[PDB]
Amino acid sequence: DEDETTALVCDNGSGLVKAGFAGDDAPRAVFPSIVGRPRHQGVMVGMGQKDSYVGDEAQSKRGILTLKYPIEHGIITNWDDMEKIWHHTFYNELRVAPEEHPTLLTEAPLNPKANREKMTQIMFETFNVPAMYVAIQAVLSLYASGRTTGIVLDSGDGVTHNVPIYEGYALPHAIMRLDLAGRDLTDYLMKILTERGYSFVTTAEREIVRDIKEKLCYVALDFENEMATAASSSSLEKSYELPDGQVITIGNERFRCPETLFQPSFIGMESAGIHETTYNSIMKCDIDIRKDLYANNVMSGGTTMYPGIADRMQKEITALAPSTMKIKIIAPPERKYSVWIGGSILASLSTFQQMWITKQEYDEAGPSIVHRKCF
Amino acid sequence: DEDETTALVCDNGSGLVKAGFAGDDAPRAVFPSIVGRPRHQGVMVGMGQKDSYVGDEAQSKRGILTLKYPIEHGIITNWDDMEKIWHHTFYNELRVAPEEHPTLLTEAPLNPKANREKMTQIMFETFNVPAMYVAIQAVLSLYASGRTTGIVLDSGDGVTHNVPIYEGYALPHAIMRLDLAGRDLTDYLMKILTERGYSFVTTAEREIVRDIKEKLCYVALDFENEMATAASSSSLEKSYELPDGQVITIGNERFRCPETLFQPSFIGMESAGIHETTYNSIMKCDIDIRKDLYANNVMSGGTTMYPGIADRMQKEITALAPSTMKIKIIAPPERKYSVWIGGSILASLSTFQQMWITKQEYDEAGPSIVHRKCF
Amino acid sequence: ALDRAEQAEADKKAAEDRSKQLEDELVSLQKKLKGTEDE
Ligand SMILES: Nc1ncnc2c1ncn2[C@@H]1O[C@H](COP(=O)(O)OP(=O)(O)O)[C@@H](O)[C@H]1O
Ligand SMILES: Nc1ncnc2c1ncn2[C@@H]1O[C@H](COP(=O)(O)OP(=O)(O)O)[C@@H](O)[C@H]1O
Ligand SMILES: [Mg+2]
Numbered sequence: 001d002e003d004e005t006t007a008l009v010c011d012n013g014s015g016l017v018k019a020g021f022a023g024d025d026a027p028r029a030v031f032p033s034i035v036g037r038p039r040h041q042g043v044m045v046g047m048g049q050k051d052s053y054v055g056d057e058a059q060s061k062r063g064i065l066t067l068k069y070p071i072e073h074g075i076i077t078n079w080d081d082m083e084k085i086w087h088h089t090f091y092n093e094l095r096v097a098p099e100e101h102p103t104l105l106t107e108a109p110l111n112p113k114a115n116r117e118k119m120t121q122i123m124f125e126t127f128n129v130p131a132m133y134v135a136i137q138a139v140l141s142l143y144a145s146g147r148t149t150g151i152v153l154d155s156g157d158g159v160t161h162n163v164p165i166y167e168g169y170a171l172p173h174a175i176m177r178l179d180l181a182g183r184d185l186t187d188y189l190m191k192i193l194t195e196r197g198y199s200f201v202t203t204a205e206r207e208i209v210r211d212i213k214e215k216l217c218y219v220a221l222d223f224e225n226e227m228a229t230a231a232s233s234s235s236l237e238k239s240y241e242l243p244d245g246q247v248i249t250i251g252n253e254r255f256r257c258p259e260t261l262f263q264p265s266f267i268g269m270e271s272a273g274i275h276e277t278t279y280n281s282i283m284k285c286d287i288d289i290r291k292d293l294y295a296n297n298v299m300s301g302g303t304t305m306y307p308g309i310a311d312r313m314q315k316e317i318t319a320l321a322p323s324t325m326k327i328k329i330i331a332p333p334e335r336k337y338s339v340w341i342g343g344s345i346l347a348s349l350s351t352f353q354q355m356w357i358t359k360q361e362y363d364e365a366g367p368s369i370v371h372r373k374c375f
Numbered sequence: 376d377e378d379e380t381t382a383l384v385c386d387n388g389s390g391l392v393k394a395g396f397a398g399d400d401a402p403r404a405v406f407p408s409i410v411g412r413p414r415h416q417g418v419m420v421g422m423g424q425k426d427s428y429v430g431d432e433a434q435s436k437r438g439i440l441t442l443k444y445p446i447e448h449g450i451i452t453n454w455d456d457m458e459k460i461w462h463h464t465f466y467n468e469l470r471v472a473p474e475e476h477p478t479l480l481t482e483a484p485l486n487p488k489a490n491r492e493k494m495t496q497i498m499f500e501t502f503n504v505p506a507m508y509v510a511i512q513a514v515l516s517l518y519a520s521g522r523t524t525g526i527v528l529d530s531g532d533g534v535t536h537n538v539p540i541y542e543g544y545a546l547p548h549a550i551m552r553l554d555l556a557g558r559d560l561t562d563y564l565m566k567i568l569t570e571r572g573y574s575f576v577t578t579a580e581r582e583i584v585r586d587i588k589e590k591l592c593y594v595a596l597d598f599e600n601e602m603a604t605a606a607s608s609s610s611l612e613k614s615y616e617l618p619d620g621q622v623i624t625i626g627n628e629r630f631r632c633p634e635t636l637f638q639p640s641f642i643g644m645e646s647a648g649i650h651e652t653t654y655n656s657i658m659k660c661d662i663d664i665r666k667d668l669y670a671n672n673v674m675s676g677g678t679t680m681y682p683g684i685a686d687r688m689q690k691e692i693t694a695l696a697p698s699t700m701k702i703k704i705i706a707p708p709e710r711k712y713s714v715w716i717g718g719s720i721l722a723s724l725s726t727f728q729q730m731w732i733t734k735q736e737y738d739e740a741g742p743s744i745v746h747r748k749c750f
Numbered sequence: 751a752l753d754r755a756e757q758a759e760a761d762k763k764a765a766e767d768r769s770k771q772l773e774d775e776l777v778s779l780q781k782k783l784k785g786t787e788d789e
């Protein structure tokens with residue numbers, strides 16, 4: 001299927017795995033990060049004895065399979081799910097073995113050392129891979145953006161990373177990760193819908209309402225004013241049609257769901273909102289480059305697909321920062337895949353072909369030394 | 376409770392307020408500098424309507440109250456917290472009114488004029504105090520040390536001051552403040568523990584790990600060699616028992632946490648380490664007295680309670696300065712309270728009773744003139 | 751019985767914390783004494 005000896009770019013982002021060959025502009029195999037496991041034991045004869053579903057095979061059946069998240073906040077919980085999702089991506093979709101081409105994986109900023117050593121060991125010992133490389137997502141996203149300056153805000157599913165890069169330089173000190181993202185928003189919407197009257201307590205409905213949020217939920221331009229005008233609703237409340245057919249009616253809750261990002265007090269945490277944390281990060285940077293960080297801020301992550309985030313960011317930053325300079329916020333189209341896109345354009349360089357880590361040096365050095373070599 | 380008309384020594388140091396009457400050898404009321412504010416709104420009936428907790432009342436409950444620091448880097452952020460902590464210290468612990476005795480407060484070197492004018496105004500207009508006085512911490516610490524020569528290194532919680540005093544002579548031009556202290560060390564330990572695997576993002580855990588650091592974290596005598604020998608750990612890693620019961624295992628991170636003081640590059644700041652900044656300060660002084668500053672260097676601040684700071688300072692200064700002279704470093708026992716102790720022995724002199732500032736002259740002159748009179 | 755057990759356990763925890771603090775202070779003091787003797 002592939003006639004070019006190039007690394008397979010597999011972005012294992014929290015919530016959605018995006019795998020594809022280098023050189024492509026979009027991932028071909030896109031599936032959620034979920035593992036379905038047979039709950040009961042059947043006396044039936046003939047069905048697949050497979051004890052571990054994955055991807056679309058699990059999405060197609062969520063009532064029988066208990067759903068487990070292979071990644072939580074960033075820390076890898078179960079490694080069997082890791083081996084399952086890579087083995088599946090290798091021998092069920094791509095139809096190619098890892099013994100013929102490299103593999104450029106993308107990991108989140110500020111992750112545990114155990115996670116890195118574990119994935120590297122599974123990719124070297126178990127699977128025969130000629131070479132591995134771990135890369136931070138923020139750099140590849142800035143590559144795909146086509147710039148060298150700005151602060152990347154990557155909001156995945158269970159973690160949110162703010163990474164400032166000015167003039168093409170990393171700042172490992174200022175990267176601050178906060179576990180507020182799509183899962184805590186799904187939980188907030190679920191508890192407020194339970195407050196509305198429709199109560200559910202199973203994961204399949206949680207994924208359904210997550211999809212409903214992805215499709216409908218947006219960000220408000222003025223929270224309190226929308227609350228007041230929605231008190232007497234007319235066009236502000238919408239009636240959604242569940243894929244099963246049950247008629248759901250959702251009004252203001254939509255534009256109050258992502259608001260939890262701006263007010264973490266809703267989930268009883270002393271952490272500051274994403275905008276205030278980004279602002280504090282800007283103060284932690286130097287003054288000289290702060291204006292450039294204001295003018296080149298970039299966004300990444302699937303959570304940014306909601307309509308109305310750019311305007312909300314502009315008003316909040318204008319209210320926090322002075323209103324004398326110019327603070328333009330740029331969001332490139334299809335930003336979610338941009339990271340993966342970067343991977344593709346990063347795997348075609350010959351120099352990058354010279355910066356890989358082969359098996360033998362890793363085996364003698366050991367995983368810890370490999371951690372030192374990368375950074 | 377008090378039968379002597381003597382000033383109340385209230386050291387409002389960053390991180391810990393230490394209040395007590397003059398003449399005593401240690402502060403009786405010692406509580407952290409924190410303000411707990413009710414996060415949610417309760418429908419319950421009967422609980423205290425008090426809207427602002429302080430001190431031990433806030434320490435006892437950190438899960439319900441969002442914690443705010445009343446002092447940051449040195450600059451006073453919120454004045455309501457100031458009024459709260461003084462009113463509390465006056466009408467909840469000491470059980471004495473400020474209308475009967477003076478008050479000798481201690482402020483940090485090189486502080487804003489707004490801070491001084493604000494505290495003086497709250498201490499004159501609002502509260503009826505017969506007389507106020509602002510004092511620098513370094514002089515009182517040198518008093519308690521029982522000498523007149525040396526360079527005082529006061530490392531509080533959010534600021535670190537290096538103050539050279541030779542023959543009792545202050546040098547306002549050489550005092551250089553740098554905002555590297557216990558909070559940036561707590562942040563570094565937190566991010567590296569998040570790197571280890573245990574991730575938290577709330578202030579209560581931050582205070583808990585701060586206490587864990589105060590109890591366990593020490594300074595290394597040789598960073599790289601300890602790194603090498605800790606690669607294969609045995610007795611170098613310790614298993615701590617959280618007050619809640621969760622078994623934490625912390626190894627090298629301990630003696631790498633305060634190392635950020637010696638290598639500010641970890642937090643991406645061009646500032647120099649505390650030892651190098653002190654060395655540069657010594658070059659800024661005159662050569663004649665430099666040897667005396669080498670032989671009489673004194674330390675102050677709670678951050679100095681870690682074991683192994685004296686030896687690390689000696690090796691670093693010996694590596695930086697020549698090794699021909701004698702460079703003895705002296706650290707008096709219970710140095711943290713020494714400052715406060717000084718206050719006590721400073722409030723008993725009759726001459727000091729003649730150097731106070733009464734209400735009437737301040738009222739006619741105004742606060743700015745009061746600033747000129749002090750210095 | 752459980753109340754007395756919990757009280758005794760609290761007292762034991764306090765005593766053991768004090769003992770461990772004293773042991774840490776003692777080993778640090780021994781190191782300082784060794785250094786002073788070398789000097
Ligand atoms: N099309 C979409 N619309 C709205 N939200 C989305 C969409 N796709 C993903 N998300 C949200 O983004 C999160 C996953 O993001 P992720 O795939 O990790 O981004 P990236 O791959 O850029 O790191 C989930 O919480 C999900 O709710
Ligand atoms: N017993 C202790 N052990 C270790 N560190 C301490 C201790 N007490 C205070 N500290 C540290 O000192 C800082 C506060 O110092 P501070 O009370 O301002 O000193 P001072 O009162 O001498 O100015 C905090 O960052 C805290 O972590
Ligand atoms: Mg993302």
Ligand SMILES: [Mg+2]
Pocket residue numbers: 388529530531532675676677
């Ligand atoms: Mg201090």
